[PDB]
Tab-separated table of C-alpha atoms in Angstrom:
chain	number	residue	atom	x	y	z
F	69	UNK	CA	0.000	0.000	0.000
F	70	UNK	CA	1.099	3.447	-0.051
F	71	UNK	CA	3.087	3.193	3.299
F	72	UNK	CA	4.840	0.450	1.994
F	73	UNK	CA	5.539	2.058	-1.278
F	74	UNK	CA	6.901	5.276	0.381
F	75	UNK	CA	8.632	3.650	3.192
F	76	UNK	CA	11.069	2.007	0.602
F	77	UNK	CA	11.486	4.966	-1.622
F	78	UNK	CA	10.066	3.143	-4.742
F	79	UNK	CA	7.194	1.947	-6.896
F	80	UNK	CA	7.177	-1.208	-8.103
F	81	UNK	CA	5.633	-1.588	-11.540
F	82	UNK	CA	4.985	-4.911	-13.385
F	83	UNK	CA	4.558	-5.375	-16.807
F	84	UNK	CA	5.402	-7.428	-19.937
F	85	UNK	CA	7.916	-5.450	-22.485
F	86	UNK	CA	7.071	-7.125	-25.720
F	87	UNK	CA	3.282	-4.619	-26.417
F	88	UNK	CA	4.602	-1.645	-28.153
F	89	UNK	CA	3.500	1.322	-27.687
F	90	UNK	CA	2.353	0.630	-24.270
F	91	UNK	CA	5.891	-1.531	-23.127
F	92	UNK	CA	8.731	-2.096	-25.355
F	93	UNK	CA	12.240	-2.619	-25.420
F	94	UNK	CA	13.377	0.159	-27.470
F	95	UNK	CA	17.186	0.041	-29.234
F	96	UNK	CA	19.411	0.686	-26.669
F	97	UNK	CA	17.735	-1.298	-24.615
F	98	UNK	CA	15.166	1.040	-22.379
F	99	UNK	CA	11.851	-0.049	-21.551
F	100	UNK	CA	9.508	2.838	-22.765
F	101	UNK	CA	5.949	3.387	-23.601
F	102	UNK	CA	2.764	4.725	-22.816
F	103	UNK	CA	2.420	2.597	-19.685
F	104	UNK	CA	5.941	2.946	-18.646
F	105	UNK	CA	4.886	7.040	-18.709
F	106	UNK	CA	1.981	6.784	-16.906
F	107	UNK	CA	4.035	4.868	-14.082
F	108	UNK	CA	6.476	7.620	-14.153
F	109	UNK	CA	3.631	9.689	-13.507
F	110	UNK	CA	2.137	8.264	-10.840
F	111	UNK	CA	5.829	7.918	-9.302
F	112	UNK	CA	6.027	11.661	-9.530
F	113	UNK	CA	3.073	12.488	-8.153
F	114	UNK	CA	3.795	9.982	-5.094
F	115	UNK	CA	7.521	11.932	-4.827
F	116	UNK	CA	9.152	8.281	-4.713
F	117	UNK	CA	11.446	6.852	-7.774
F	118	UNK	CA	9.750	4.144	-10.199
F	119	UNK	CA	11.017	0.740	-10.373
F	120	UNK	CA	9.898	-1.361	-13.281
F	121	UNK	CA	9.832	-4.872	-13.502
F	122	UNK	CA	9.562	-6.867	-16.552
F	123	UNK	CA	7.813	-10.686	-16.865
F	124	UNK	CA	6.199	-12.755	-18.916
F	125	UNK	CA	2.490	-11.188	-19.232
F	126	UNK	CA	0.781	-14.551	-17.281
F	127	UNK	CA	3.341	-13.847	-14.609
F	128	UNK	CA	1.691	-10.317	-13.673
F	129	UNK	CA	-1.011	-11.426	-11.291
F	130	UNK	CA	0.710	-13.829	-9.165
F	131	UNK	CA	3.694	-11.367	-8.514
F	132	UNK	CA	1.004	-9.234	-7.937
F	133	UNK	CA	-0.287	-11.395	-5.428
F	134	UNK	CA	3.446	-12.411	-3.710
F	135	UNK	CA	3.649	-8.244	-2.994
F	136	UNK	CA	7.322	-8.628	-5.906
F	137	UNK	CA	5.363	-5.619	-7.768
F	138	UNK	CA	2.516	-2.942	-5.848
F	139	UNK	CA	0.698	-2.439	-9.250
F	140	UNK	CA	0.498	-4.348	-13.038
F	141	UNK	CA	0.388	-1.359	-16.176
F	142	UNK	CA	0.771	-3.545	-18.935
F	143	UNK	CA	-1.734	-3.075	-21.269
F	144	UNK	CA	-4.450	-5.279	-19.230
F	145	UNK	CA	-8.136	-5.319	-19.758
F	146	UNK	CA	-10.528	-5.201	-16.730
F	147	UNK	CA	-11.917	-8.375	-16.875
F	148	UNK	CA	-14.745	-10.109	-14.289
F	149	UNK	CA	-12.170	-13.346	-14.036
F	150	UNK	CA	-9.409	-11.226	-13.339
F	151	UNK	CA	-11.424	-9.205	-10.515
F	152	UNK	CA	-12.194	-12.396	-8.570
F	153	UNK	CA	-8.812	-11.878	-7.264
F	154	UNK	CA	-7.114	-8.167	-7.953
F	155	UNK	CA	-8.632	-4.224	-7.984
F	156	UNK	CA	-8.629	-2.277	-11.036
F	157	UNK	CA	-8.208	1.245	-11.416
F	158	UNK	CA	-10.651	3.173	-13.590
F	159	UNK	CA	-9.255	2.783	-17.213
F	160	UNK	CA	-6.507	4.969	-17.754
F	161	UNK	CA	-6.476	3.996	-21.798
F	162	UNK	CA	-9.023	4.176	-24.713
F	163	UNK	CA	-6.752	1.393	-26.617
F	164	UNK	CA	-8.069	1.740	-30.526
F	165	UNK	CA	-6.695	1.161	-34.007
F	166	UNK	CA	-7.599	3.568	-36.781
F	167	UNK	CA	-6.603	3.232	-41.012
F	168	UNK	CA	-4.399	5.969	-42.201
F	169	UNK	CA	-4.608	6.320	-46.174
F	170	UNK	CA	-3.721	9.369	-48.746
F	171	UNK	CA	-5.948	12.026	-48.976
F	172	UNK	CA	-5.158	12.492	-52.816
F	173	UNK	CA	-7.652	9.329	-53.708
F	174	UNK	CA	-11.446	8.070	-53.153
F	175	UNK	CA	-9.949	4.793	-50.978
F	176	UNK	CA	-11.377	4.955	-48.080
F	177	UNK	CA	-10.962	1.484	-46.093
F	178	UNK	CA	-13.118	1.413	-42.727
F	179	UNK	CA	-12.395	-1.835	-41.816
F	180	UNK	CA	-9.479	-4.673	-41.833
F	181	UNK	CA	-11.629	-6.672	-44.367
F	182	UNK	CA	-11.397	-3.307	-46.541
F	183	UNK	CA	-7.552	-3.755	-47.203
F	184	UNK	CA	-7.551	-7.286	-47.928
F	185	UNK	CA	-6.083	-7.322	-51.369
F	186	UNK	CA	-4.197	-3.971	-50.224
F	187	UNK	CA	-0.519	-3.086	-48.910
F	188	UNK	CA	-0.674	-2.451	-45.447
F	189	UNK	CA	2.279	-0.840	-43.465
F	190	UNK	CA	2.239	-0.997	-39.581
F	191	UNK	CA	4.955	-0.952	-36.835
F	192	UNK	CA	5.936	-4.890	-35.454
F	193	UNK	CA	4.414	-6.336	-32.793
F	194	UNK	CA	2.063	-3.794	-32.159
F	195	UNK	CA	-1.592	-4.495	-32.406
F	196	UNK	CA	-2.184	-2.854	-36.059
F	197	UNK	CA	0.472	-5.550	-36.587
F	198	UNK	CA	-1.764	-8.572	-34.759
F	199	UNK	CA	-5.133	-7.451	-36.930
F	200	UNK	CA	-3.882	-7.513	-40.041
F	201	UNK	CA	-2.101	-10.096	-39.931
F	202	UNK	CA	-5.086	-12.470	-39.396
F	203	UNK	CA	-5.987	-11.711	-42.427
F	204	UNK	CA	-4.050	-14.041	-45.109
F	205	UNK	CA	-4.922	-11.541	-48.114
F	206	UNK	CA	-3.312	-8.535	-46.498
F	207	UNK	CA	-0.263	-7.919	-47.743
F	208	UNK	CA	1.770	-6.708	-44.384
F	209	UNK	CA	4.641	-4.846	-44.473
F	210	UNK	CA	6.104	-4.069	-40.817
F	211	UNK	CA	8.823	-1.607	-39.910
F	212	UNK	CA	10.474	-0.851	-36.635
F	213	UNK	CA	8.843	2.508	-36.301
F	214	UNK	CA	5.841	3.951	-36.986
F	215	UNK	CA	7.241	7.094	-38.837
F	216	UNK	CA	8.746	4.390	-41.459
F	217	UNK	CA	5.360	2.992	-41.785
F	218	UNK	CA	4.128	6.183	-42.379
F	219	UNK	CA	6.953	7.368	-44.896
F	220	UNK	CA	5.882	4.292	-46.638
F	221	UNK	CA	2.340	5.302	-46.988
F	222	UNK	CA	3.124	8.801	-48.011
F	223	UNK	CA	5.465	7.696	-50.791
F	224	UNK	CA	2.709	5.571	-52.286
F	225	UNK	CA	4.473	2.224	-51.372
F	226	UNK	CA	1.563	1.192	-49.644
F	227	UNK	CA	-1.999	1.640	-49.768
F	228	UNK	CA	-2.411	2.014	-46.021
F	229	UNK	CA	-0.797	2.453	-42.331
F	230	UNK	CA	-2.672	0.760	-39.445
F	231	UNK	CA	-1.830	2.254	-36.227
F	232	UNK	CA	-3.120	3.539	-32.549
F	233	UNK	CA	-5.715	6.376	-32.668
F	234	UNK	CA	-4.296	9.315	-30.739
F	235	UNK	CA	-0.562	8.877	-32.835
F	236	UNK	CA	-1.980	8.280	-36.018
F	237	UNK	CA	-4.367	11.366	-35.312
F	238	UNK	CA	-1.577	13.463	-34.149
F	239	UNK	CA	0.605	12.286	-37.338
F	240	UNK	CA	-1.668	12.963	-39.721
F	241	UNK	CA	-2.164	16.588	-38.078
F	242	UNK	CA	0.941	17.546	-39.071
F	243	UNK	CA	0.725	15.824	-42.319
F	244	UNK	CA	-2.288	17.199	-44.394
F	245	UNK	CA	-1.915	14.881	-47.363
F	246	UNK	CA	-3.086	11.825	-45.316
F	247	UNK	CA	-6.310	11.244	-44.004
F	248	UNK	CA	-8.000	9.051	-41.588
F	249	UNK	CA	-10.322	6.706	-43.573
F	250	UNK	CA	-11.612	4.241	-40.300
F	251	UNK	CA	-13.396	5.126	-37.133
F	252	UNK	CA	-11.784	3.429	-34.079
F	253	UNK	CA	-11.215	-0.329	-34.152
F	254	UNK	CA	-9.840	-3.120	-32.171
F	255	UNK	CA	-11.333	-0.837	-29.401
F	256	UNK	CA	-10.146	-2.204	-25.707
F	257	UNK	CA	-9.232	-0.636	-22.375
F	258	UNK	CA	-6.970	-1.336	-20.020
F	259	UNK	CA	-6.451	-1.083	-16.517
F	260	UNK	CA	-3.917	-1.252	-13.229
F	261	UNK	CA	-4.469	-3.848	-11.361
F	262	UNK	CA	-3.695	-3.474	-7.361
F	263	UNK	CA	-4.355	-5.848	-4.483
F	264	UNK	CA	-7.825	-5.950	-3.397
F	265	UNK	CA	-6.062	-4.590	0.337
F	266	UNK	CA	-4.627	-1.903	-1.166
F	267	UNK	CA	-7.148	0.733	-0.586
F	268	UNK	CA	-5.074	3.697	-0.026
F	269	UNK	CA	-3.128	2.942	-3.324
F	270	UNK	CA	-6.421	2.275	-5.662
F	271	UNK	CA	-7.912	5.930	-4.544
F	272	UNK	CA	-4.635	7.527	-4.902
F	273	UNK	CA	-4.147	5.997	-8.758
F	274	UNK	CA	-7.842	7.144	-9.354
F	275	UNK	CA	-7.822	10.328	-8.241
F	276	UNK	CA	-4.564	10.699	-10.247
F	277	UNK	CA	-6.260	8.947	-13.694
F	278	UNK	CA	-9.126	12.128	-13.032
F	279	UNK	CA	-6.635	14.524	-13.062
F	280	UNK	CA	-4.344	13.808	-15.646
């Protein structure tokens, strides 16, 4: 709880580093991401330095439950089986694909099944990357970062860029000759899990997720 969390001078954060953009091993070897900044924000706001600790995605709960981490962000849905025996936060994430394409044309794809028979860029392992590539008559092209997958789109060497909402939104802000030609899909939110005990710790991350 927060006592213990404050009395050691760090916050212990669990999560699995192979779910870009949320946790990822970038190339010198950092875990970064969306989740890994919210943790750093909730660290902040507690005043105590942020400790994260990286395990296989099954492993989360039961270091949960052994007290090795006070909190899982790792890009983890709030789910009835998992609250039989851990506390969720409010969602903290509005998780959500969109389909980038160029303005300059009427193609206008609103779904996956919409670019089967298309070239589809997207950055690996994330979950643009995991959609369409259930799809057999996609043809997937995957680059280490999303700006390649955009540059690839832009130069017309492929017909679309799958990619999370808010980035490809904020991308295609600043780059008027694409469009975005989906609403949201692949829609999902995630949560922090705490113990159930943890009552001082839950309210604290809440009132924190209001105010960011």
């Amino acid at each position: 709880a927060i006592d213990e969390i404050k009395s050691r001078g760090y916050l212990l954060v669990g999560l699995s580093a192979d779910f870009p953009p949320f946790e990822f091993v970038d190339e010198n070897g950092n875990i970064v991401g969306f989740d890994v900044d919210l943790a750093k924000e909730i660290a902040r706001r507690l005043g105590v330095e942020l400790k994260i600790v990286d395990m296989t995605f099954d492993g989360l709960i039961p270091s949960l439950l052994t007290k090795k981490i006070d909190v899982i962000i790792s890009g983890m849905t709030i789910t009835e089986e998992r609250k039989k025996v851990v506390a969720f936060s409010d969602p903290y994430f509005d998780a959500g694909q969109v389909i980038v394409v160029r303005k300059d044309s009427d193609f206008r794809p609103k779904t996956y099944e919409d670019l089967v028979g298309k070239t589809v860029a997207v950055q690996i392992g994330t979950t643009g990357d995991i959609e369409v590539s259930k799809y057999d008559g996609i043809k997937v092209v995957r680059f280490d970062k999303f700006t390649d997958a955009f540059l690839e789109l832009k130069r017309g060497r492929a017909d679309a860029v799958v990619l999370d909402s808010a980035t490809a939104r904020a991308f295609v802000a600043k780059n008027p000759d694409l469009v975005i030609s989906s609403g949201v899909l692949s829609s999902e939110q995630y949560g922090i899990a705490v113990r159930k005990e943890d009552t001082d710790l839950l309210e604290f991350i809440n009132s924190v997720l209001r105010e960011l």
